[PDB]
Amino acid sequence: PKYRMSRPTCRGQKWTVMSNVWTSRWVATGTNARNIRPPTAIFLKKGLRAVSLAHNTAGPNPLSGTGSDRSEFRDLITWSPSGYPGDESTETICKAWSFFACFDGKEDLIGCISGPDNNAVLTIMYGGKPTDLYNSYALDILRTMESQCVCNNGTCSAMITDGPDIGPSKARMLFIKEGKIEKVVIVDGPGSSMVEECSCINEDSNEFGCLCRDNTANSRRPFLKCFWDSRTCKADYTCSQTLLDCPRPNDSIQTCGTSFGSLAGGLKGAYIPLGKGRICATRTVDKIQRKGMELMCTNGNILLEQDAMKKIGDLVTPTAQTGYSSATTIPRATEECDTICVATELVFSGAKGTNADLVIHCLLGEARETESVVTAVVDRTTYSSLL
Amino acid sequence: PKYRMSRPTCRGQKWTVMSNVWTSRWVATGTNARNIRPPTAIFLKKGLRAVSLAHNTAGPNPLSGTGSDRSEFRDLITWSPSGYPGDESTETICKAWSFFACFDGKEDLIGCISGPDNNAVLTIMYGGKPTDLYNSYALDILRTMESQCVCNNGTCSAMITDGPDIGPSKARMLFIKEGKIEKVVIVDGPGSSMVEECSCINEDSNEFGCLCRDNTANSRRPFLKCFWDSRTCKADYTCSQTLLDCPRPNDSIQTCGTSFGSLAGGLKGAYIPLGKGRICATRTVDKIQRKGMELMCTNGNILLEQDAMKKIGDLVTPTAQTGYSSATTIPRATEECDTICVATELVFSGAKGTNADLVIHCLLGEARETESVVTAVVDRTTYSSLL
Amino acid sequence: PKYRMSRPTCRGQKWTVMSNVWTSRWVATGTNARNIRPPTAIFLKKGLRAVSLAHNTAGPNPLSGTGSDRSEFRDLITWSPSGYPGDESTETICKAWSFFACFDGKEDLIGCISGPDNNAVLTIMYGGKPTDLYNSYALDILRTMESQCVCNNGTCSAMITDGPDIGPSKARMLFIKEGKIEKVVIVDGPGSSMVEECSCINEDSNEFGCLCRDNTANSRRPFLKCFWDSRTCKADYTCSQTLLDCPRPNDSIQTCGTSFGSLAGGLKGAYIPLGKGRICATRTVDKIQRKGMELMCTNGNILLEQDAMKKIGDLVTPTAQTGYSSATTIPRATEECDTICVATELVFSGAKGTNADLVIHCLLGEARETESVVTAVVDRTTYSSLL
Amino acid sequence: PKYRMSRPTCRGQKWTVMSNVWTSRWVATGTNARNIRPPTAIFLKKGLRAVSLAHNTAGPNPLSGTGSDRSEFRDLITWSPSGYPGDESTETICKAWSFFACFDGKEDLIGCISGPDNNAVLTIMYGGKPTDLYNSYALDILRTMESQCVCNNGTCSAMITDGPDIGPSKARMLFIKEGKIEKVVIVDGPGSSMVEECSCINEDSNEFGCLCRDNTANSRRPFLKCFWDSRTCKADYTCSQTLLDCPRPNDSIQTCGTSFGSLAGGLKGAYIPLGKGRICATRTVDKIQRKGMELMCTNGNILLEQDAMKKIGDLVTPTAQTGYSSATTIPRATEECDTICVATELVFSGAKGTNADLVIHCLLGEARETESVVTAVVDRTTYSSLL
Ligand SMILES: CCC(CC)O[C@@H]1C=C(C(=O)O)C[C@H](N)[C@H]1NC(C)=O
Ligand SMILES: CCC(CC)O[C@@H]1C=C(C(=O)O)C[C@H](N)[C@H]1NC(C)=O
Ligand SMILES: CCC(CC)O[C@@H]1C=C(C(=O)O)C[C@H](N)[C@H]1NC(C)=O
Ligand SMILES: CCC(CC)O[C@@H]1C=C(C(=O)O)C[C@H](N)[C@H]1NC(C)=O
Ligand SMILES: [Ca+2]
Ligand SMILES: [Ca+2]
Numbered sequence A, B, C, D: 001p002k003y004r005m006s007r008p009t010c011r012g013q014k015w016t017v018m019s020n021v022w023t024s025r026w027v028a029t030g031t032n033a034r035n036i037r038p039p040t041a042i043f044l045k046k047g048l049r050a051v052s053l054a055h056n057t058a059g060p061n062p063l064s065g066t067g068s069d070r071s072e073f074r075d076l077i078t079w080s081p082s083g084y085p086g087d088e089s090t091e092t093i094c095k096a097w098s099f100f101a102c103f104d105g106k107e108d109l110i111g112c113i114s115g116p117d118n119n120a121v122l123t124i125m126y127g128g129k130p131t132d133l134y135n136s137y138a139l140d141i142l143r144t145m146e147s148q149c150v151c152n153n154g155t156c157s158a159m160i161t162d163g164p165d166i167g168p169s170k171a172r173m174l175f176i177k178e179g180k181i182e183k184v185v186i187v188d189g190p191g192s193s194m195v196e197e198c199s200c201i202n203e204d205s206n207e208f209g210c211l212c213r214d215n216t217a218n219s220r221r222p223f224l225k226c227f228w229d230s231r232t233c234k235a236d237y238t239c240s241q242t243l244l245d246c247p248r249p250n251d252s253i254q255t256c257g258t259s260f261g262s263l264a265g266g267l268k269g270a271y272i273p274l275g276k277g278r279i280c281a282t283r284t285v286d287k288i289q290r291k292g293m294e295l296m297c298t299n300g301n302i303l304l305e306q307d308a309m310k311k312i313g314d315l316v317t318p319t320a321q322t323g324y325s326s327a328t329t330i331p332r333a334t335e336e337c338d339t340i341c342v343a344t345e346l347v348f349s350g351a352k353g354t355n356a357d358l359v360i361h362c363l364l365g366e367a368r369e370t371e372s373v374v375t376a377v378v379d380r381t382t383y384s385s386l387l
């Protein structure tokens, strides 16, 4: 076993639907399907895995409080990308109401944040063993990405932040080898005031990048750019007139560098670098509601160009309720790039609480200048009354 | 591990029943037995496995629609040849309403077709990772074999087809190494007009063959013959007076080359080459209803000779409801041939929806000019009211 | 991995209770505990395992017919020696209403007999793959040991029989390497007329032996003695005045060689050779009812001496319902002998059918001239009303 | 694999909560959560594992008697540190109403005591096979630690004791290589009269120590000190004014060497050596009721100095009901010390019987003169009525 190196993502032809997690089907069926939020997909030591926080409950008679963000019962669990949480493939990982995880080629690296709001704590596990920690520095909900960390020759990196969820939230970048924090970088830059829930992908041998959430009125996502060799990072707002966050106003042309938006709030969304020159991102179809999930791409520098990001397609039924989304990269055994998949959360709720389905698209086929998407249908009308 | 090489099947003495999948027993017991259709057996990396599509539901209170063929909830799953779908051995593979799978000696190759009818997509996974795709070319239900692909020195081949399920459905052959499509052959030949649900088996070091379904009035099965070295294929109709499809008229002598039949429809059926000079196949005992499954064999060229195939025996209670059937081959360390087993589907239905049991016969023992069959009994009278 | 060699069993000090399978507890609890008969323990590739035929049903609402011996739904399953059938550790093996199994050091060897009474068939699996078969020669319920086969340097051996269960039942011995029957021995000798359900243990580098059931009026168990080098076997009645079968009359002194007994019927019981000079056996405490299970030993030749076998102790509560019993041998990594354990079946029945618990004693501690037993208490009075 | 060598624990910065076992959550959810008592954590071959005795039952309808200590249905089981007993991770080990376990770097050693009160037996398993026994010597509930044994170069040691739970209970130390008892030491010393439920940890390359329970009025804990090379042990009472047992009177200065206490009873408690010169221990916050669990540390000889131990923090909500506590050590590839975690039991009861949750803290981060503790909250108000 060798450490995976950072490498570009594979370009391709079409985003196909590798699998979906139909949690809601098993909730309505009546099995012990667990309440999960916010699911995504991460490539781990066992292969591709669905990963999510959970609540140490399950249907058909779940306990109260499944809509809560943080609690003593919150959980980090993984299961098969075509399974459901609570089935045979389910693995419990750690205590957590915020998490990250990734696989460096030898072992799984895991961040588990829990504890009280005024002094929460990141516990780092490597190989199933607790190996290190990180302490709250703003004393106001230390928290992390809710998606994959990123790795290269034994160094994995992971964003954390801490601070008022309306005011400033000065983020930090951790660099971790065999579960030990070797370096902590404070992220400065014109898009650093409030950065959270970064979705990070390796872009090339020496660089990775993230698209984050700004929970302030700003609708332009902060972008974190990091370099492996120097272990350094910086943040800038996206300049493309295509606003990626939710809620947001209409797309419009504004001078680069500054924040833009009138609607407080935010949503975690995927960063999908394609090859060394292309940038894609997911955004909701609805400007205010978390409905739909469309893929937008440009070949230009989205930090420097107000040029709009073209729509490649609808990952999901555009009126279906969605939620978070993030990508992960999976090795391709016979060429120098990683397959990239994006997982979008499909939130639902009812008499059995808040919960989420998952859908996983992957970019496959020979490289194309402009790709297309297979739309995943989300239609619960034949069983929603049992949810 | 070495790549498995194509080799003839082992002759034997008797078809014995290796195991039952008694899905109906567990449905009536009350456990979370999943609704499955076309189930069959395939030799995978874990060993012999029962393989089927499912609906992301289970008893005792299944969701509506288990009878449907293609929905967004359809998935591909595998379990123990002697277990039941949903039990501890169950593994969820991918999103699929049509599938193929096989094991090349190093990894499982898996083909998962889903998406809309007018533009479905085959996603190809190898060793658990999505590696490639193939797009719809007739824009009318791209689909595939619902049984094993075949392999040799890292190359595995799989039939796909596309087009109206009554009109022309010109099929194609994929040749795949490590999950990457290396060659696509349009299959031509006098029996190639409408070809689907091919059941394929390695015949010899350089040959493999398939017996397919023609869904028109024609009751002679299309037979696909392929050569590994040239990666080349051809389709011809069977000629023997023993008509293999269901529905069919009486057996009768007719000139070779042309289709023949009076009732539209079809049924996936097993091709069972036995050694180098012997051909067997399965067919329903009933000419019109999917009831019973008898085994017919000949030592002649079924594509060139009208001779009746000799009924070897009844795999199953001949008035029992059956369904699809197909074979798979299992390595034998002792000699240079593979063991061959046939799986026959046993469809049932009731209060808990549409579903199926499975029975698995294997040819074992000293080679015999003519073999016998243990008839697996199918009698549900003691518990059918709970179905 | 090397093949295990035949070696003597380890002498010791006390029979301790390594574990029990409390099927009845989980039946009363209300989980999906499976109806099993007749359980025993066998050392397999995964370690010590509880092994039994089952019925493809489970509580809390089992289907009818769990008291049947042979049926299409009968099953061979294994699970953890301290588990229960149907729990997480359960493995389904094959179709079977009669079975054997053992582990040769590289792979598991398994015999699965099923099919109709007038022509049943043994299917042999090696390593999870069907490898060979054996055919009914008396056309009257081919059947086998229901306990471990025995192995040595790749040859495992297993008793089978066939014939009227009241009249003659001329048994045969199979010798099997990598799943292939290499030799079949017809067992002659003055105790061969009716031999079934042999319980076989390796005794020394070149010899194994079995204590069998004679279902005729005879209460003296047939003993099969076999030699590895010549692959040969012979049968003689036990001569000890201590009658080991059930039902049986009082112990009494009679001339060696002949049958003795007045009560038709029989029961499978354990053969426990201790070292190279000692012979133990289990028998019911009650002479007619299958209640209790006591261990009897002698250092003399039980085929040649009417000397009584001394009672070492009560494996189980002497008034508790028991059933079958048989031993299995487990390697001891640091000396030339195998630990021996005896598993006794504890049958129970009720509103949820016929079923069985299991208890496993093993002989541990430094060698003693006369050993002792820890009595396993069997008392269901706090939950039996839920059975 | 190499045998693990005895080595000091790692100092750190903060006790963080690695995971909850929320058995109560799953009992109230309605799944088959098993009733467990004294649960703790132990590093085994699989990794960190939650370990406990159980009753061969589970919710939602458990069988009577879950409150009992020693019955024929008691068994030893292990599961995920973040799962629940009975879930997918559950493993059944042996029959036991008292136990120990550890992993020597190659295999799990496991000690299982069961049998009648006046003659119980310790069965010793190594790597899954029964290897040895130890017999009752006081004929009054032979019993053991209910926590990890300790290992070094293939030798693992375990405390056992025997005798009235109020009168003298002279303990013994077993030294075991590959499951065979190599040495038994009668532990003498001024604190050796009544010694039970010792919680033992490797202290340095040649030393390990235990903090035990004295079930008389005495509230100073017996401390066992053992040397690996001589395989030699001794028992002395703790002297610090900080009384560790429960029930206890107020802390007060008293002369070293003698017992001291006013209330009969006792409670298993954790010994937590930290590096070479530091000692911590757990005790209830409440002096009489098993409520809360605070961590106390000193850098002095607790056996020779009256100095109070400094309260480091509350592991748990201090009015929450707790129970047993004990530590385990986890290898660290990065340096020459082991990580140390403490598991505190959280007993609950109700309609579904007696049961327990588990919380697991681990010392992580840069070494600190004095460490802090994340307080794991225990609040069941939202679901307790279902317990
Ligand atoms: C990091 C974003 C912010 C932290 C307070 O709120 C998030 C928004 C969420 C949301 O908008 O849906 C759900 C997240 N579970 C929550 N994170 C935490 C740690 O509570
Ligand atoms: C749509 C054509 C197709 C033949 C390949 O019909 C099949 C017939 C079936 C049948 O005759 O029972 C059931 C199959 N699930 C179905 N396959 C798909 C993909 O829907
Ligand atoms: C080999 C013994 C004889 C065979 C007819 O009866 C056995 C007696 C049994 C018994 O006495 O309890 C149960 C066994 N399941 C049965 N075996 C078969 C194959 O049916
Ligand atoms: C019988 C003495 C013994 C102390 C080692 O009492 C323990 C006290 C217990 C307790 O105080 O809660 C519960 C333990 N399960 C019990 N152990 C056994 C073996 O019964
Ligand atoms: Ca915003
Ligand atoms: Ca047809």
Ligand SMILES: [Ca+2]
Binding pocket: C214, C215, C216, C217, C218, C219, C245, C246, C247, C261, C263, C264, C265, C266, C267
């Ligand atoms: Ca008899």
Ligand SMILES: [Ca+2]
Binding pocket: D213, D214, D215, D216, D217, D218, D219, D245, D246, D247, D261, D263, D264, D265, D266, D267
């Ligand atoms: Ca005390």
